Amino acid sequence: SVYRFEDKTPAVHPTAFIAPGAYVVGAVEVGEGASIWFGAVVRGDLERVVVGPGTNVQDGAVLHADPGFPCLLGPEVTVGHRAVVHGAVVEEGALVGMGAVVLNGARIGKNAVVGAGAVVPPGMEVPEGRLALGVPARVVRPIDPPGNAPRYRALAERYRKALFPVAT
Amino acid sequence: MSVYRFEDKTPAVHPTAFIAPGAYVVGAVEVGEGASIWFGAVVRGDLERVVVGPGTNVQDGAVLHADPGFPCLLGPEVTVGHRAVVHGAVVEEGALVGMGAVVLNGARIGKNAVVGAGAVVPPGMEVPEGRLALGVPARVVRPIDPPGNAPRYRALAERYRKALFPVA
Amino acid sequence: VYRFEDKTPAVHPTAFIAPGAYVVGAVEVGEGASIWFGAVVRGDLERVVVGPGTNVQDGAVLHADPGFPCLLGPEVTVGHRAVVHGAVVEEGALVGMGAVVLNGARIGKNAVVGAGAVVPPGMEVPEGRLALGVPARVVRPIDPPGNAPRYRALAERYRKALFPV
Numbered sequence: 001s002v003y004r005f006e007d008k009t010p011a012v013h014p015t016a017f018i019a020p021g022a023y024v025v026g027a028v029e030v031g032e033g034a035s036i037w038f039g040a041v042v043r044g045d046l047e048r049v050v051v052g053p054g055t056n057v058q059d060g061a062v063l064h065a066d067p068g069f070p071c072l073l074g075p076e077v078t079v080g081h082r083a084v085v086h087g088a089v090v091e092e093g094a095l096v097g098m099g100a101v102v103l104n105g106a107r108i109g110k111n112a113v114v115g116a117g118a119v120v121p122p123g124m125e126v127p128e129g130r131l132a133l134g135v136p137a138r139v140v141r142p143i144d145p146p147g148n149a150p151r152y153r154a155l156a157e158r159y160r161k162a163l164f165p166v167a168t
Numbered sequence: 169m170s171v172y173r174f175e176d177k178t179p180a181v182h183p184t185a186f187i188a189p190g191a192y193v194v195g196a197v198e199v200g201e202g203a204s205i206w207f208g209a210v211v212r213g214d215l216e217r218v219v220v221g222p223g224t225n226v227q228d229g230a231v232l233h234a235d236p237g238f239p240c241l242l243g244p245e246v247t248v249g250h251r252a253v254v255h256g257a258v259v260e261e262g263a264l265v266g267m268g269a270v271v272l273n274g275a276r277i278g279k280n281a282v283v284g285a286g287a288v289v290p291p292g293m294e295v296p297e298g299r300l301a302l303g304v305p306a307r308v309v310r311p312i313d314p315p316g317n318a319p320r321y322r323a324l325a326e327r328y329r330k331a332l333f334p335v336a
Numbered sequence: 337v338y339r340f341e342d343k344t345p346a347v348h349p350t351a352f353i354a355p356g357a358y359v360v361g362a363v364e365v366g367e368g369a370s371i372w373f374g375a376v377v378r379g380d381l382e383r384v385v386v387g388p389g390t391n392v393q394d395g396a397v398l399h400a401d402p403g404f405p406c407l408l409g410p411e412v413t414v415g416h417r418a419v420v421h422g423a424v425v426e427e428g429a430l431v432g433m434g435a436v437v438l439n440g441a442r443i444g445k446n447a448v449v450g451a452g453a454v455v456p457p458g459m460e461v462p463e464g465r466l467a468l469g470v471p472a473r474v475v476r477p478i479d480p481p482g483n484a485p486r487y488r489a490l491a492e493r494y495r496k497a498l499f500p501v
């Protein structure tokens with residue numbers, strides 16, 4: 001569930017969805033309508049992590065932060081399956097593609113897209129409305145704004161209404 | 169070992185399948201006979217169905233999900249390597265998705281084909297039967313011998329169902 | 337912690353094993369080591385060794401194939417969501433987050449595998465060197481990473497004061 005490390009307690013909005021098997025630990029803030037999915041890990045100890053309103057952190061993703069590099073997810077952000085966002089700033093409407101890695105100090109602009117499996121080097125800026133892909137990542141072109149966040153606001157509310165464990 | 173019902177979608181898991189501790193099979197999922205879903209793996213079907221074929225192993229930390237119009241359909245004797253992501257794609261009989269790889273919506277992995285470890289298979293890419301695809305992004309490179317992971321995991325799963333116990 | 341047949345993990349009392357981590361089978365976990373949330377350390381057909389003071393971070397995966405033991409040396413860091421498979425990682429080294437290290441590969445002393453890099457089977461990363469790319473390429477000498485001392489201290493803090501809310 002939700003874990004207090006020493007005296008650091010996650011602050012989770014009651015409309016947020018924390019899936020079974022997800023771990024929210026320590027200095028973490030999870031906003032209204034946010035969702036953290038199965039097997040995801042959100043840990044804030046040496047530095048804080050913010051999951052803005054309506055931001056979804058999909059299955060197997062990992063959020064963490066280093067001193068001086070807080071992990072700040074803006075509102076209506078999507079962190080795809082198995083992505084790692086570490087000490088970076090992701091602004092409103094952006095998408096971190098599934099399997100991608102965003103490193104410390106990187107900055108994902110509004111409605112920007114980090115391609116699947118791309119590795120964003122430390123400090124790199126992804127401008128607003130642009131697609132960055134590759135290993136290492138590189139700004140390629142303008143890209144249409146992702147629509148994953150409204151999908152996951154609604155999918156999360158359905159999960160909050162009808163999720164039941166069943167034994168076999 | 170438990171499984172998760174989303175709305176009216178309960179996973180249909182064959183009795184000979186092995187579902188490991190820490191694995192999360194959610195919603196519209198079929199898990200075939202002799203299949204195995206290993207520790208920390210997530211197989212989630214809600215927006216669209218997901219099928220784990222018979223004798224198919226979904227290894228540790230792997231993530232399966234499907235998008236509208238893109239079912240995630242794993243054929244028989246398929247291997248999804250450690251920490252891979254197969255999203256809304258078709259994987260034909262005997263193929264291998266290398267560990268850490270990502271396979272995106274609409275991709276098709278031909279029979280006995282191999283996705284290289286860490287490779288990212290773009291949406292809609294077709295990997296022909298018996299071929300090898302690797303790189304970021306993935307490219308079909310050469311013909312490769314059929315992998316033999318699925319038989320070994322059928323047997324390893326059977327050993328786990330008989331002698332896996334929690335300790336202190 | 338899970339036993340597989342006759343294979344029981346041997347975990348030192350000072351090691352931190354976070355909730356949601358899965359240590360399975362023929363696994364050694366040394367003094368002052370830590371296995372964090374969602375990580376999977378599985379040893380069945382071959383042995384895995386997590387050396388003293390070595391941290392296996394969140395969602396990382398360790399496994400081994402016959403003849404390829406996964407041997408993590410002391411003071412080693414396996415970053416978030418990394419995969420180290422049947423490889424040898426020497427003292428002080430760093431496997432960057434999201435990276436993949438495959439069978440028979442050797443990560444030299446204080447070497448660094450960059451984040452998301454894929455070290456092919458059998459490849460050697462020499463001591464004090466950085467490897468990047470997919471596949472991996474030895475790029476330049478790098479200063480010793482300092483993650484292992486920080487995580488030794490963080491793990492002892494987590495062993496003492498971690499409670500579900």
Ligand SMILES: [Zn+2]
Nearest residue numbers: 064065086416
């Ligand atoms: Zn970290």
Ligand SMILES: [Zn+2]
Nearest residue numbers: 081233234255
């Ligand atoms: Zn998805």
Ligand SMILES: [Zn+2]
Nearest residue numbers: 250399400421
């Ligand atoms: Zn393996």
